[PDB]
Symmetry: D2
Subunit: 420 residues, 4 copies
């Protein structure tokens, strides 16, 4: 236990009356709306989202990285911090690894995860940066590089990510590369895409029967003119061409300005190619900010589509969700905790939508009442639901508050010497 | 001849000397670069782009419309003006009609075209506005409207466009609707798209083998929250789903800010779904401005993908090129003329690209030289070639100058009600 | 009374039981946060936003207009509909008129307003479209047109607006123009701005001592390349140059993609040039959609700045708020009603912000808690406070429901032509 | 000479014939247009743009950095590299330093400059990153930070930059900070701006009589929610508040999507607050790509505004232009060489515009001929002019090729230690 259980008990107990009071008042409100709070809380308790191992360390920009105290160094420190998030929120039982950043003895990794109450989600390859001793540089690309040997090296690396994953209980490989161009003419759009497809096919072959291969699109950065896997369009083409085990990941901040992202999610669901959604928020580009800190309604609308599919069924709908953020000015553990909270909030509110009435208003072209139908769910403060769900599953009523009272940050600060 | 042949001759002779000097100098420059200027002029003389019948009249915004003098009244006046663009540029031999705005007797349309020296490009259906006497309003959609009757009506209108088209020489149906929503929840994305797909399939059945069914995506406007056919991604799903004769249409100004459009072009070409282009320029949204008036380089880069397609030997690749612009503050004829000129300008520069050298710099990851290889073609002032091509084919060295020296605007201003 | 009072009371009783429960519960919740739900309600009852006389009529785009039943015709019909919005929501006691659209005997407008329980807000001049019998077209601009006569005509019209407003009680003139260019070179940015400044100076001279002159910026549309008053930066230059009675209007959907609108509001407030805010919502451009229907948090954040201004004790702060929306796919009356409610919602949420706690987290750079302090206020469902505010002031608990139960649309649909 | 003269000579002679044919042809074409080419060349050979010392090193993103061979070791190697750019383009006689990065004995900096034929442009302060031993971190800001001692520390640093500048011949301080917030509520917008204005006033107070203070706006990055100096509006307010010596710097890639940047330039000129223009090119955000590589027409339109200023007779307009770019996938020296060329290219075309005819078309609202009048200039290939200008001033007819023929990169690669 990273956080002392008595601390959690103590903090949860001092707030129990306040929680009960809010949970009952909201229950009566929902009752009058033909909604059983219990059924909502039970689904909220089972909604999980994978945490990225690299998310608990302080992020930065090309201009600077301002570390806080107790920076986790290495996958072990990182797992230890991810455990706090899971313990207090009970919404992140699985961690997503990144190779080579988190390379370590498989057996040791698994053992550490099991001891912490954490599992492992999709593996993440890295061919957007060069590692020491690497024979071929990825400066000009990897899987789509013009040099065959470089592509081969990129493919072999992704294969190794699978072998590591197979050994720790993982069932998928996410592939996000920087590949693209910064100048017009630098790359031949079609030929680079062909090279990419060809290299991905080889990785696809190394896929066990129960594994999936996720490709992630991004409009720009690190490439500033063109990017091989630039949008969900190219992303769909990829998934369809690779096969059944290949699907597309939709990362909120990876789209052009004003893009209707929730429609992209619905389009992928329909054609059974939505592998999963990567949560974060943005205002300008791929800001990788805390989920819901900028546009919480947008987040709700995305979840509205997920819930529609989750309820109405849909062939091939088994999303692998993950938070992908950079925490440059906050305590990384606190931001991930509140972001996971935000993700469950949007989920919970999506569950309140009256699907029948909505469908009626859409059929009648009653736009005002259709949008109002969503707003009724969205405007609902489901915090008591999120907190109770946490309380019933070993979590903290108020995660951040509990995390602060535990002095966890100061503790790892004493154990982890900083640069200065 | 909408324009007096003597006016054309006078204004050409007035610029002949200068064109000879410019053409020979560029000819010499290109020879040093290993390019035969005659081979380019020959290709430029063959590049054509369709003019929109509805682009010959002054356009407007939701705030106002400020018509100029001699506004065309009806499709026949419009064809008369389109003939001027063709006569002077020799690059716009085909007119794309819009129904029901251009509804008229087929035989007459065909005859007028033949007399003016104009053919007919793709037909354009219109279910994004209610025509008088219409049974069902498209207020809430057409091909994807929730009401079955409204959808059938829209389907029927599209089939009718095909009938009118067969009788006048058209070989394609362009489908662009405003279908979408302005509010979250108003529509169910998936079901709306399913309806659209079923409707389009019905239209596909009635599509002749010598025709192409072009669907056109747009991010927003008229719909401000979501649009059924919002981007090329959906456009590809549509075309793929519909059949070998269904292709995607790419309108330059119909994309999200900063979208790399030339890549969209390359992607569609690779999967054989690039039906054609709708040229125009923009800076903010779907501004429908004169081609290359805002970003001429982007226009060159789009054409760079087109010229590369041919070089890479892509089979059956014959995209239909059409200009889709609104002229709110200029003489629609001059704009269209210069827009067509700009399009040909971009194409000619693209032809100057040293494909071998570019391929070499791309393989060796010499980004600087690869970009400079494109710039060397783009920086070349190809006006001499554009002017010569026009001259050798009956056009004007300086189209707009000739157009103004004829007093055509004043003329039709006196023949048409103000 | 446009809406039968028996209906208003019947629909309120029908929901009076559920409301009391929700109200008491929120009251209890707020008390635990050290907030007296009555003080909040008291201030919400006093928050007003003006309604545009042109907003009650169905809006459209350059592609089509899909009118509904009983479309109002003329100012008097529009005032009748605005009265409904005011009666049910009690948040729109003032109407903003637009000339020449609403030109009519001032004495009559004044009387009809007093009878309907409506006042008149800022006047709106119209030089972005031509009226019949107009001597000079505004095709190429109005207050900044190169033609002196045209600028003079634009100035007189605005002066005329001031006069009509002086007779009906208005205290401000709002000037939004389309003036700009669609092509590079068409306008000399500086010369054009100079002309605008000089002309606005003349309109300023016709301002009574207690009036305000509001200049409204807009990035683009109808001008697609450049706009004389393109952003708040240029807007500030205008207000600072004209004088103390000149201020800037910030319209939500008139900004570039991703712009931080709330910072703009704060900057203008800091320098005393925030004349007022124009509410609506958007996703792509100047969509003019219902306020908060797309991005409610942004709406809330704008109000957070408005509320903080009072908290810091900004002197002379009296913004003239107004709704500026286009309703193309819903009953205009219904949309304006929910827009006004959404506005009050953001306002009430802004009031719930624990300023002491917030400044505390800002001071010690506790970003996470600072942002959570806002969220605690924003996430709070204040509908009961809004519904209770309307009930106590003669409005409806569920305005749109009451409106639909009254059958008002069918009524005016019968009294008015199709 | 960084580049041997026999090489520059040989390469020039190799291209003399083609240059002669293209220049004389163009000259004739211009004569037929009523333009004397010699007059353009004479103005072109005197147009200078300052080069950033931090631009001759390979740049990177927050994802990776892929250095090339011969990366400059310190400021002295960097000046050496800038000397090559100057020798070959003859368009970048001045270098802009960045403190503390370029810290060194002012006497030695000045001496190396004079020795290489380089002058020093605007000084650049750095409070967007933490240098060793600071009493306070700029993590949450610098000049607008809530902590008084932190702001005082940033102020002092800027004053030190001025002292170094005065010792080496600089006449200005460029201030660009990262200050802002990544979360709504994190900063009180107004309080932060007030703190920034007060602090900047103190820096202003340290300005010599003939120095200028340039404040540079930027929409986002590193801050992803709000930025203190976010746009030209805020920038104008700053310059007007500080005084006559304070002006605004306009960096191309620092504006929101679709922004009309040329108008901004016009607006700042009209009110006398355009201190200078930082050149680069972009497509998505602050891409910092080679100038004119993405949108050459927009570059031309910016110059059109600069030149129209002289046409309208603006007095005392002497803007301080600088290139501010990041070269992640090219030889920095080559990218800087071609960017400088592109800038002179756009400047030359702007000089070719028929202002007389243009003012006529603007007055009678002939939109079409007005736009075509600019195009007739922009479409003109002025390369021959740029090349001749370089030949006349000791530069190379084709800088990049001459640079490659010299083998300068391999030479410095064998002299400079790669970081380990
Ligand atoms: Zn991701
Ligand atoms: Zn990302
Ligand atoms: Zn189109
Ligand atoms: Zn269009
Ligand atoms: Zn407005
Ligand atoms: Zn507007
Ligand atoms: Zn800069
Ligand atoms: Zn920058």
């Amino acid at each position: 236990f990273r956080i002392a259980q008595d601390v959690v008990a103590r903090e949860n107990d001092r707030r129990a009356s306040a929680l009960k009071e809010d949970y009952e008042a909201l229950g009566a409100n929902l009752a009058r709306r033909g909604v059983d709070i219990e059924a909502v809380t039970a689904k909220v308790e089972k909604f999980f989202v994978a945490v990225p191992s690299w998310g608990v360390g302080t992020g930065g920009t090309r201009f600077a990285r301002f570390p806080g105290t107790g920076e986790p160094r290495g996958i072990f420190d990182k797992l230890d911090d991810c455990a706090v998030i899971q313990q207090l929120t009970r919404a992140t039982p699985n961690v997503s690894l990144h190779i080579p950043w988190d390379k370590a003895d498989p057996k040791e990794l698994k053992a550490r995860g099991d001891a912490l109450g954490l599992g492992f989600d999709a593996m993440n390859s890295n061919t957007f940066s060069d590692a020491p001793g690497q024979a071929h540089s990825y400066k000009y690309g990897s899987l789509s590089h013009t040099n065959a040997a470089t592509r081969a090296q990129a493919v072999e690396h992704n294969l190794e990510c699978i072998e590591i994953g197979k050994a720790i209980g993982s069932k998928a490989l996410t592939v996000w590369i920087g590949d693209g161009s910064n100048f017009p003419g630098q790359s031949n759009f079609t030929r680079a895409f062909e090279r990419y497809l060809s290299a991905m096919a080889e990785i696809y072959k190394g896929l066990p029967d129960d594994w999936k291969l996720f490709s992630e699109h991004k409009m720009y950065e690190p490439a500033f003119y063109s990017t091989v896997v630039q949008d969900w369009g190219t992303n769909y083409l990829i998934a369809q061409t690779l096969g059944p085990k290949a699907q597309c990941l939709v990362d909120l901040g990876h789209h052009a300005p004003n893009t209707n992202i929730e429609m992209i999610v619905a389009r992928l669901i329909q054609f059974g190619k939505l592998g999963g959604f990567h949560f974060n928020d943005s205002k300008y580009g791929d800001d990788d900010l805390d989920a819901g800190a900028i546009e919480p309604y947008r987040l709700f609308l995305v979840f509205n589509e997920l819930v529609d599919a989750e309820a109405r069924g849909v062939k091939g709908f088994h999303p692998a969700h993950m938070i992908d953020q950079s925490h440059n000015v906050t305590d990384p553990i606190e931001s991930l905790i509140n972001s996971a909270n935000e993700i469950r909030r949007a989920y919970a509110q999506a569950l309140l939508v009256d699907r029948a009435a909505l469908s009626g208003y859409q059929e009648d072209n009653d736009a005002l009442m259709a949008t109002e139908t969503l707003k009724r769910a969205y405007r609902t403060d489901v915090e008591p639901i999120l907190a109770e769900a946490r309380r019933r599953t070993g979590g903290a009523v108020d995660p951040v508050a509990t995390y602060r009272a535990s002095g966890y940050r100061a503790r790892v600060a004493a154990e982890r010497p900083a640069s200065v």
